[PDB]
RNA sequence: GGUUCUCCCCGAAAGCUAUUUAGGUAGCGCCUCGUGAAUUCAUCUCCGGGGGUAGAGCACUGUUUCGGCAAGGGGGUCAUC
C-alpha cells in the first residue's frame, strides 16, 4: 500500500520516482516505444508467410 | 501541485548511445530481490607485456637569433655592339 506515510517506505511518491511519465496519472509510453526511434520490430524486415 | 500508520535489511544516478531529441524516453552502466556457479573477483609481491604522455631534444616537419664561409639578388660608378 503505497502513499500511506513515511514508515511504509512508499510515501509521497508511490514508488514512481519524481515527475516522469510513470509518475503521471495515466502516463507512460506504449509497447515497443524506443524513445522516438522506430522500434526493432520496425527496423527489421518482414519475412515468410503463414501456411 | 499533492499523495495519509510503523519497524527492519540493502542501497543509486544526474553517465554513454539514439531520438521533430535536448526540463521526455528507450537500451546499456550503476541499485535491489531471487536462483545458480568455479581457489570466480579485488588488493600486494614477482614475472611477462604494448605505450610514446610528462619531461627532454632539434636529425626530420616548421619556427628563431648570432657568427663564419658564400653563390645569388638589389643599388651606384664606368661601359652599356
Ligand atoms: Mg525509499
Ligand atoms: Mg513531485
Ligand atoms: Mg519518473
Ligand atoms: Mg548501509
Ligand atoms: Mg519537455
Ligand atoms: Mg611534451
From Swiss-Prot:
Residues 1-37 are annotated as: Disordered. It comes from the Bacteria. Residues 4-14 have a biased composition (Gly residues). Part of the 50S ribosomal subunit. Contacts the 5S rRNA. Belongs to the universal ribosomal protein uL15 family. This protein binds the 5S rRNA. It is required for the late stages of subunit assembly, and is essential for 5S rRNA assembly onto the ribosome. This is Large ribosomal subunit protein uL15. It comes from Escherichia coli (strain K12). The lineage of its organism: Bacteria, Pseudomonadati, Pseudomonadota, Gammaproteobacteria, Enterobacterales. The gene is rplO. The chain holds residues 18 to 68 of 144 of the full protein.
Amino acid at each position: 500500500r503505497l502513499g500511506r506515510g513515511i514508515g511504509s517506505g512508499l510515501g509521497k511518491t508511490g514508488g514512481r520516482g519524481h515527475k516522469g511519465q510513470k509518475s503521471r496519472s495515466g502516463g507512460g509510453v506504449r509497447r515497443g516505444f524506443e524513445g522516438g526511434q522506430m522500434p526493432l520490430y520496425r527496423r527489421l524486415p518482414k519475412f515468410g508467410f503463414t501456411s
